[PDB]
Structure formats: structure tokens, C-alpha cells
Amino acid sequence: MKYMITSKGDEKSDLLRLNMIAGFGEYDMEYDDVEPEIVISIGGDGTFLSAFHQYEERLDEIAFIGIHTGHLGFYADWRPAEADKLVKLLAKGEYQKVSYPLLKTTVKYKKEATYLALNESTVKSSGGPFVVDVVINDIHFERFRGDGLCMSTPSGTTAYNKSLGGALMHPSIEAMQLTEMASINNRVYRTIGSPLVFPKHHVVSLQPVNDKDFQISVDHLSILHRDVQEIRYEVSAKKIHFARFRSFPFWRRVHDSFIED
Template sequence: MKFFVASKGDHKSNMIKTMVEQYLLDFDLEISKEEPDLVISVGGDGTFLYSVHDYFHRLEKTAFIGLHTGHLGFYADWLPDEIEKLVIAISKNQFEIKEYPLLSMSLTIEGESEPKKYLALNEATIKKIDGSLVVDVNINGQHFERFRGDGLCVSTPSGSTAYNKALGGAIVHPSLSTMQVTEMSSINNRVFRTIGSPLILPSHHKCQFVPLNRDQNFVITIDHMTKSVDNVVSLEYTVAKERIRFARFRSFPFWQRVRESFISDEY
């Protein structure tokens, strides 16, 4: 089996990266940055996001596992004091694959012949640089509402515990093939009105944002990436056909992760 170890880049993470590489080489596994069967991310959830984006072109062939140098995160099953257990598990090449949905975003810019395509593991957002964001929200080609406010966030089930949760969105189990639209400080009064609640859309739905004024600057994010764009005709979101593959060497139920991350044991 071929593997690659991605590091956060700090001293601790780099030391662990070197240690994991040497152990796996001792078990006759092969390092391959270009064509890994398994990518081991050492750092935090941010490092994991970077690692996944580096291999979006070979999702069907590469599985991912996270080793957290801090505390357990949503994309990390292992801690530094468990390195030997992890290495032995990998060397036996016996692991379960869990596939979870990704988000697909299509950005259409005025004057460009083809839309730009992006994938996100957590979420994609749109905001205005100055003033309120005003966009028409269409679902499956039908007008749903005219949104006015700070911005909109479209998240995957895996990303529902990230920015989406901070915005008041629902936590969705990552086995469900859905996407979620949440508002950022919408304007609701006698003149302007939005739904005011998160929308959870199934995999066969499309959600489209159409700016009322294209001659504006927008800030869009795709996970950790931020882009400033103008002349936006539309942004279309769907549950991606591609899926991310997690390598599971032991059981770590999603709701246990949620509880340990957000609920204290002290009552």
C-alpha cells in the first residue's frame, strides 16, 4: 500500500510525521505523494481540509485519516500517544471505508464561457464586501425568496458542526446525502422577509443564488479558501457526485464526536 503523511508544519506535527513515515517504511509500505492509497493528516481539522483538497482529483482511489496533535476533532480519530496502534493497524491493511457527501459549487461569471467548478468538504459561503448581500434564492429552478443580509452558507453534513452550527444550523449526520443552507443575519421587517430557518435539501435538489446587481464585489469561500469576485451571474450548489473516503480502523460514532466536542461532562 502507498501512503503519504501531510503535516500542519509546526515542530510537533513534523516530528510525528517523520515518526509515522519511518514506522510505515519499516513495515514495507511505500511513500507516494502523487498516488497515495492512504493520506494521513497530522495536525488539526484545518490541516485535514488542506490535505483533502490536494487530492480532490483522485477521491475514488485515496482514503483519508486524521491524527490530531491537539485534541480530537471531527476529522481526526487518533492522538499522538496512539501512533504505534495506528501504524500497526495501517500495516495490517485492514480498515473500513466510510464515504460521506461533498458539496459542489458552480460559479458563473459574466463574460466567461464556462462556469468555475469547486468541491467543498465543509461549506461554501457568499458575502458582500460592503453593505448587505441581496440575492434571489432559487430551488430547483423556482424562485424561493429574495435574501437580504450579511451572507449565506451552504454546508455538507460533515461541515454541519462547523460554521453552519455557529450560524444556528442543524447538525446533520454525515451518512445523509444532503446540503444545508443557513442565513447570516438576514434582514426581516415589514418590507423584507426571508424564511429565517435553515433549509436541508436532498441530493436531487439544486440551490441557486442570483445577485440582483452583478456590478458588485463578493467574497466567496470554499472551505479554507477565500476569493474576491465580481460580475457574478449566479452560484449553483448541489450535493456532489464525488464522495470523500475515510479510513476507519476503529469505531468512533458521530454522535459521540458531537457530544465530546460540544457537551461538557460536568453537570
Template sequence: MRFTVRSRGDHDSNMISQRIKNYLLEFSLEFDPESPDIVISVGGDGTLLEAFHEYTHRLSETAFVGVHTGHLGFYADWQPEEVEKLVIHIAKTPFKVVEYPVLEVIIRHNGERKSERFLALNECTVKSMEGSLVMDLEIKGDLFETFRGDGLCISTPSGSTAYNKALGGAILHPSLSTIQIAEMASINNRVYRTVGSPLVLPQHHTCLLKPKNNVDFQVTIDHLTLLQQEVKSIQYRVAEEKVRFARFRPFPFWKRVKESFIAE
């Protein structure tokens, strides 16, 4: 089996990453950062997001597992004191693969500039740099509303516990093939009106945003930030690709939600 290890970069994460690498080499596994079968992320959810974006070109062949060296995350589910146990599992146990949907984002530009395609594990946000963002929101090719406000967040079920939750969006189980649209400070009065509630779209529905004013806006793809100009449209849907996680033990999602937001 081919593997690689990604570290958050702090001292503890680097030390644990080196231990994992040494252990797996002793088990005769092959260290291969170019085409790994499994990526071990050591840090937090942000470290795993970075690893995901590094290997989006081979999601069907690579599985991810996370060791958290900070606060307990939704992706990094192994603790530092469990490293030896994890290594033995990786080396000796055929792991179960759990697949979750990701978000496809296609940005089309005015003029001759080519369209850009991205994948997001958590979410894509569109935010005004100054003033109000005005965009037509189409669903399945039909105009649904003209949004006015600070911006919009389009998230995956896996990302529903992140920025989406802070905006009042619903928490969705990561196995659902959906995307969710949440508003940021929408303007609602006698002149302007939006639905004002998060929308959950099924796999076969496409969402399209079309800018209506000349306000510069910022697009984020998970942790990546892009300043967009001359944008014709931004299209969202559930991607054909899926993210694959290596599971060696049960990973109860609702228990993790409770531990993260309710239980002390």
C-alpha cells in the same frame, strides 16, 4: 499500499509525521505523495481540509485518516500516543472505508469567462464585502426567496458542526446525502422577508444563487477565499464524488458531538 503524510507544520506535528513515515517505510509501504491510497493528516481538522483539497482529483482512490495534535477534531480522531497502533493497523489491517457526501459549487460568470467548479468538504460561504448582499435563491429552478443580509452558508453534513452550527444551523449526521443553507444576519421587516430558518435539501435538489445588486462579495470554499466579481450565478448540490475515510475502529459521531460541545 501507497501512502503520504500531511503535517500542520508545527514542531510536534512534523515530528509525528516523520515517525509515521519512517514506521510505514519499515513495513515496506510505498511513500507516494502523487497517487496515495491513504493520506495520513497530522494536525487538526484544518490540516485534513487542506489534504482533501490537494487530492480532490482522486477522491475515489484515496482515503483519509487524521491524527490530532491540538484540540480533538471531527476528522482527526487518532491521538499522538496512538501512532504506533495506527501504523500497525495501516500496515497489517484491511481498513473499512466510510464515504460521506461533499458539496459541489459551480460559479458562472458574465461574459466569456469560463465557469469554475469546486468541491467543499465543510461549506461554502457567500459574504458581502460592504453593505447588504442581495441574491435570489432558487431551489430546483423555482424562485424561493430574495435574500438580503450579510451572507449565506451552504454546508455539508460533515460541515454542519462548523460555521453552520455557529449560525444556528442543525447538526446533521455526516452519512446523510444533503446540503444545508443557513442565513447570516438576514433582513426581515415589512418590506423584506426571508424564511429565517436553515433549509436542508436532499441529494436531488439544486440550489442557485443569483446576485441582484452590485455589491462585491467574497466566496469561501472551506479554507479557500475567492473575491468574486461579474458573477452570474452560484450553483450548489450534493456532488457525485464522495470523501473516503479509512476506519480502523468505531467512530461514533454523536459521541464526538457530545465530547466537543457538551461534556467537559
């Protein structure tokens, strides 16, 4: 079938990349970076992130695999030494597939823009103070004054979400999580402080009070958006499909990354 391979650019990953292509020629595997059915990234979670944010118009037709040339990753959870056995089982077939939830981000102003995020989407101010009204399913929930907000996917709870005091969520739970950044609370302003986890179909909307320019990030990407009228956070209908062979539990992957490997 059709496949392609992403690389981190260094000498370690490119050499490991060419050794899978050479072994791929021994099987019935055609190389195609325009219409691959298997995306394989080699490097780190950042390399996997880019490989995702490149074929995100056909997420329901690709099974991704991630290999970590450096430390262990949460998406690149395959050691380089197990590359040969990967190609053998990858080129055969009849592997199990795994899907993780995603986060739709809608921006309304000059039309309206839409984004998919594997990790999280964060919102800050253009330079001055960050003030937004937080509407949850058409209901004004709070008025947030601080550095910004961050809505995270389940598999993205281990990333920026974790730095902000949020909870680590098992990615089999179709949900999204909102976390606060240096929220100022006093006799005047009042934020919930706690992280909030929203199920499917739950819509969280951010609306400006004064400044209508917000520096918005979608995973690694980050753009300053001008004349913003609304931001829509919502669990996406699309899911990223993983290819799996051996079992690597998310909780074990959490153990190795933070406790001890």
C-alpha cells in the same frame, strides 16, 4: 502500498510525522505524495482540510486518516498516542472504508468555475449590501437581504453552520443545509429564517439583483468573484473516503467537542 503524510509544521507534528514514516519502512509501504492511496494528516481539522483540498482530483482512490496533536477534531479523531497501532493496522490492509457526502459549488459569469467543499461554502457581498434571489429547482423561493448565506455539508454542520443556528446533521445523510446570516426582516423584505436541508439532486441557485460581485468562500479558501451571474449549490456526486478501524460515532465526536470530553 503508496501513502503520504501531511503535517501542521510545528515541532510536535513533524516529530510524530517522522515516527510513522520510520515505522512504515518496516512494512510494505512506499512513500508517494503524488499518487498516494492513503493520506494521513497530523495536526488539526485545518490540517486535514488542506490535505483534502490537495488530493481532491482523486477522492475516490484515497482513504484519509486524521490525527490530532492538539484538541480532538471532527476529522482528526485519532490521539497521537495511538499512532503506532495505526501504522500497524494501516500497513496490513483489510480495513473498513467510510464515505462522507460533499457539496458541489458552481460559479457562472470567462467560463464557469467548480469547487468541492468538505465543510461549507459561504457567500457575502463585495462591500455594499448583500441582496440575492434564491431559486430552488428553477423556482424563486425568496429574496435574501443580509450579510450572506452558507451551504454546509453534513460533516460540516459542526463548523460554521453550527455558529449560524443550523442543525447538526449525521454525515450518513446525503444532504446539504443552507443557513442565513443576520437576515433583516421587516414589512418589506422576507426571508424564511429557518435553515433548509436539501436532499441529493436538489439544486439551489443564487442570483444577483444589483451588485454582481460576491466574496465567496470554499472551506478555508476565499476569493472575491467579479461579474457573477449565478452560483449553483448542489450535493456532489463525489464522496470523501475515510479509513476506519475502531468505531468513533459522529454523535460521540459531537459529545466530546461541545459537551465534555
